[PDB]
């Protein structure tokens, strides 16, 4: 592995950009000096052994943990590392020395930021929303699933200042509509806030802060290799290769240059991210394909996307509102809502329906009834959405799948909002979207264009009708409810036993190459979004896609759930690292995890049972670890007996770790997680004979966070797991 080979042709000897290299050298010396003095002052004040670190991460100082592997825990640990980084800054003006200076600048910024967080407590925070500062592991994991399928095509690290706030808003709205994840640093943030651009973790656009806070992009990106990629800490070239091949990041260096910013950009180049600046560059301050100037703001985004290799697929319908992943998570407050439909205020439904060739005119979008200019701001209308689909290869069992997509298609619109499903949908449109000209016809055109782009193989013609008359919507809701009942009846017939074929899912191998998911009718994929029916429809739509049938054959262990067919498939598709997999236990040959699991279960021998912790829970767990620390062990595609990543719904399955004792073996979950699943937990517990009140016997963080606090509660509740056989 020779990662440096990627740089081979950038600069032919005798024509080194000595202005750039000397500015990089001065900036690296300056950053390491800043860090040296701050570290010496901090060690004098707090003492060498004083702990240092970042909130809510399993990877200590992730930049150092990835590139050199040290487990920085205290101020003392930083001292040798910085010394080494200072030693590798060399006077000679070569591209290799410049990349080493950029690595040293990244190390210095990471050290300076950890020292900054020495003063940080969650209740005396040094940063407040929308600013992020250091971004916790759960956010990285929460967006990993959008990364693996390139719903997020890439990342833009924007440092400095746009020529003015309006240019900042233009390029950032453009990037947000292309779905790129943004890291913002310095005065660009205040420029965007003055223009009322939406920023924050919910919009996948992180305002890190200023100055050394830029490093919080780097320690974010490197964690992707430490998590999903399973790369060992300290494998420097392996981490750089993972970044170059999979983290499609680039830097936009806007505004007046200064030496420390240039050295940080050189560290980005050191790990394979090109830099594009809006400044004019003399020939001796540029590197082809690595440090380049695009002064014209009309071109800078496509210039960076082309040099990085990012390919964007856009629907190219002139929507009056921005559209993309950043807006999926938005919330429209009552004060900002122009109109709403459903959610128990007006009657509502949505339905996809396969139709014959006779029936439909492709591209026809019709609004039948009053449009949203009908009402005063804050008003309401009925809405019934009917998407008729004819296709040669269309099937009725695709109807629910495509219907599921409606939610997402709606939420990506800026100022469009959607929740629930079927006849319980709740839809909202903001005053801003209305002021831009958005009307119901644009929602229908959006649904049409997205369905055409996403399922070309099976939709030959698509038509969209939006009814807003109250009694007509009430009439059509009955037809939709017939379709829903047939779908529920088809789903009821599926069991692990009744079906002869389970389905693989390899979608996450783009970031977790060794990980293989096996979806069965009673075990959803650990991301929680890929059901057995979903994977089956995806394979029938794309036979050579990442979901494949696997027959249930070669049974080895009916109890733990081991079959030769799944073992073989897994061994072949895990690169011969994983030989066996039990479907019904976590204690022996558990299914592996990539890193996007909704929750983690772990066996606690002292309580004779399982703890479960979801990604959103902040707090210690009785195993003595947080969710992030546990995910550091459970993810990365290695087999971890006694630990397993799962989707939340899987807790309600009849096959839920059935060999281990199922729900009866669960002794601890977060309160909010139990409330999220209370209904299915009560139903399944009554089915098992545990009683509907069994949920009250499960300990939570209000009971305690250690074995010593939790065991007495389980003893006083008579929890059955205490009388069950120890698992191991
Ligand atoms: S089913 Fe497994 S492999 Fe597929 S997207 Fe979900 S977590 Fe990733
Ligand atoms: Cl000093
Ligand atoms: Cl150490
Ligand atoms: Ni994952």
141, 151, 505, best to mutate for ligand 1 pocket (most atoms within 8 Å of CB) = 505
| Cα 302 to ligand 4 centroid, rounded to whole Å | 31
Cβ burial, residue 465 (10 Å; 0-12/13-18/19+): middle
| Cα 231 to ligand 4 centroid, rounded to whole Å | 15
Angle ∠(62,66,68) on CA atoms, nearest 5: 115
Residue 557 pairs in a beta bridge with 562
506-520 as b/e, with b when 16 or more CB fall inside 10 Å? bbbbbbbbbbbbbbb
| Ligand 1 atom, smallest distance to 529 CA | 6
Of residues 501, 497, 591, the one with CA closest to residue 548: 501
Q: Which ligand is nearest to the CA of 144?
A: 4
Rounded distance between C-alpha atoms, residue 512 and residue 526, angstroms: 14
Q: Do 156 and 136 touch, CB atoms closer than 8 A?
A: no
Residue 185 counted as an annotated binding residue: no
Residue nearest atom 7 of ligand 1, based on CA coordinates:
527
CA atoms within 13 A on the CB side of 65: 25
Q: Between the CA of residue 640 and those of 100, 145, 593, 635, 685, what are the distances in Å?
A: 37, 21, 9, 9, 27
| Ligand 1 atom, smallest distance to 597 CA | 7
Rounded distance between C-alpha atoms, residue 404 and residue 419, angstroms: 11
* Helix or strand (DSSP H, E) at 445: helix 440-454
Ligand 1 pocket, Cβ-based, cut-off 6 angstroms: 505, 507-508, 517, 519, 525-527, 530, 594, 596
Using what technique was this structure determined?
A: X-ray
Of residues 501, 515, 460, 521, the one with CA closest to residue 640: 515
Of residues 502, 589, 3, the one with CA closest to residue 239: 3
CA quadruple 353, 356, 362, 367: dihedral sign: negative
| Ligand 1 atom, smallest distance to 516 CA | 3
141, 146, 508, best to mutate for ligand 1 pocket (most atoms within 8 Å of CB) = 508
Residue nearest atom 4 of ligand 1, based on CA coordinates:
505
| Cα 516 to ligand 1 centroid, rounded to whole Å | 8
Instruction: Return the DSSP state at 458.
Output: T
* Helix or strand (DSSP H, E) at 110: helix 95-117
Q: Which residues, by Cβ under 5 Å, contact ligand 4, an ion?
A: 594-596
Rounded distance between C-alpha atoms, residue 628 and residue 635, angstroms: 10
* Helix or strand (DSSP H, E) at 292: strand 291-293
Rounded distance between C-alpha atoms, residue 83 and residue 484, angstroms: 66
Q: Do 296 and 273 touch, CB atoms closer than 8 A?
A: no
| Cα 132 to ligand 3 centroid, rounded to whole Å | 26
| Cα 196 to ligand 1 centroid, rounded to whole Å | 36
- Per DSSP, the residues of 557-569 read ETTTTEEHHHHHH
527, 546, 590, 631, best to mutate for ligand 1 pocket (most atoms within 8 Å of CB) = 527
| Cα 25 to ligand 2 centroid, rounded to whole Å | 20
Q: Which ligand is nearest to the CA of 83?
A: 2
Token pair belonging to 604 = 């606690």
Rounded distance between C-alpha atoms, residue 172 and residue 197, angstroms: 8
Token pair belonging to 456 = 């070309």
* Helix or strand (DSSP H, E) at 176: helix 165-177
The residues, ordered by sequence, that sit 6+ positions from 492 with a Cβ below 8 Å of its Cβ are: none
| Ligand 1 atom, smallest distance to 547 CA | 4
| Ligand 1 atom, smallest distance to 519 CA | 1
Residue nearest atom 1 of ligand 1, based on CA coordinates:
525
* Helix or strand (DSSP H, E) at 467: strand 461-467
Residue nearest atom 8 of ligand 1, based on CA coordinates:
508
Of residues 459, 472, 328, 358, the one with CA closest to residue 399: 459
**Does domain 325-493 match CATH 3.40.50.970?**
no
Q: Which ligand is nearest to the CA of 234?
A: 3
Q: Which residues, by Cβ under 5 Å, contact ligand 3, an ion?
A: 70-71, 77
| Cα 145 to ligand 4 centroid, rounded to whole Å | 7
Token pair belonging to 259 = 């030496």
Listed in order, strand segments (DSSP E) in 620-717 are: 643-646, 666-668
Residue 517 counted as an annotated binding residue: yes
Token pair belonging to 479 = 């037809």
Residue linked to tokens 């560290």: 267
CB neighbours (10 Å) of residue 552? 16
């Amino acid at each position: 592995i020779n990662f440096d080979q990627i740089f081979e042709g950038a600069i032919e000897p005798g024509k080194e950009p000595k202005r750039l290299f000397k500015e990089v050298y001065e900036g690296a010396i300056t950053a390491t000096s800043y860090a040296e003095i701050l570290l010496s002052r901090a060690i004098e004040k707090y003492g060498p052994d004083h702990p240092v670190g970042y909130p809510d991460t399993a990877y200590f100082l992730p930049v150092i943990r990835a590139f050199s592997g040290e487990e920085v825990r205290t101020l003392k640990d930083m001292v040798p590392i910085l010394n080494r980084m200072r030693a590798q800054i060399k006077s000679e003006l070569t591209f290799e020395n410049a990349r080493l200076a950029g690595e040293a600048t990244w190390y210095a910024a990471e050290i300076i930021e950890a020292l900054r967080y020495l003063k940080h407590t969650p209740e005396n925070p040094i940063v407040v929303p929308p600013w992020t500062g250091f971004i916790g592991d759960p956010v990285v994991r929460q967006y990993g699933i959008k990364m693996v399928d390139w719903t997020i095509p890439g990342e833009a690290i924007i440092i400095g200042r746009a020529k003015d706030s309006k240019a900042a808003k233009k390029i950032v709205d453009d990037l947000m509509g292309k779905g790129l994840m943004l890291f913002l640093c310095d005065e660009i943030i205040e420029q965007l806030l003055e223009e009322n651009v939406k920023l924050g973790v919910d919009y996948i656009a992180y305002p890190l802060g200023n100055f050394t806070q830029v490093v919080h992009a780097a320690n974010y990106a490197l964690r992707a290799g430490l998590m999903f990629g399973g790369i060992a800490p300290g494998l420097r070239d392996a981490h750089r290769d993972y970044q170059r091949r999979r983290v499609l990041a680039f830097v936009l260096y806007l505004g007046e240059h200064d030496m420390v910013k240039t050295a940080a950009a050189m560290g980005a180049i050191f790990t394979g991210f090109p830099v594009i600046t809006d400044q004019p560059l003399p020939e001796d301050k540029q590197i082809k394909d690595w440090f380049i100037s695009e002064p014209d703001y009309d071109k800078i985004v496509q210039t960076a996307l082309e040099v990085r290799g990012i390919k964007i697929t856009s629907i190219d319908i002139d929507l009056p509102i921005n559209f993309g992943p950043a807006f999926e998570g938005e919330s429209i407050r009552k004060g900002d809502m122009h109109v709403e439909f459903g959610g128990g205020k007006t009657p509502s439904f949505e339905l996809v329906r396969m139709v014959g060739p006779d029936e439909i005119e492709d591209g026809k979008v019709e609004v039948i009834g009053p449009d949203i200019d009908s009402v005063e701001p804050g008003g309401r209308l009925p809405i019934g959405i009917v998407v008729d689909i004819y296709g040669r290869k269309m099937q009725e069992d695709f109807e629910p799948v495509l219907e599921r997509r409606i939610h997402y298609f709606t939420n990506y619109g800026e100022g469009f909002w959607h929740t629930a499903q079927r006849d319980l949908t709740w839809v909202r449109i903001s005053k801003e979207a209305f002021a831009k000209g958005a009307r119901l016809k644009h929602l229908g055109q959006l649904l049409y264009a997205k369905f055409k782009q996403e399922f070309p193989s099976i939709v030959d013609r698509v038509q969209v009708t939006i009814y807003t008359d109250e009694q007509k919507v009430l009439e059509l809701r009955e037809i939709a409810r017939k379709k829903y009942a047939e779908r529920d009846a088809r789903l009821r017939e599926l069991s692990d036993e009744a079906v002869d074929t389970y389905y693989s899912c390899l979608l996450c191998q783009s970031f977790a190459p060794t990980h293989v998911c096996i979806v069965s009718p009673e075990r959803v994929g650990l991301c929680g979004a890929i059901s057995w029916l979903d994977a089956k429809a995806a394979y029938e739509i794309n036979p050579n896609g990442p979901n494949q049938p696997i027959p249930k054959e070669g049974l080895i262990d009916p109890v733990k759930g081991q079959w030769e067919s799944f073992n073989e498939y897994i061994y072949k598709n895990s690169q011969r690292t994983i030989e066996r997999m039990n479907l019904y236990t976590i204690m022996e040959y558990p299914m592996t995890s990539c890193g996007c699991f909704e929750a983690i279960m772990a066996y606690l021998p002292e309580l004779n049972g399982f703890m479960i912790v979801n990604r959103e829970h902040s707090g210690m767990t009785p195993i003595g670890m947080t969710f992030s620390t546990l995910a550091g062990m459970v993810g990365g595609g290695t087999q971890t007996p006694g630990f397993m990543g799962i989707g939340k719904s899987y807790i309600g399955s009849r096959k839920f770790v059935k060999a281990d004792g199922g729900l009866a073996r669960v002794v601890w979950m977060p309160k909010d997680l139990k409330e999220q699943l209370r209904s299915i937990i009560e139903e399944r517990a009554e089915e098992e004979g545990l009683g509907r009140d069994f949920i009250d016997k499960i300990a939570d963080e209000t009971v305690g966070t250690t074995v010593d606090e939790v065991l007495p509660f389980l003893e006083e509740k008579g929890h059955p797991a205490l009388s069950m056989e120890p698992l191991l």
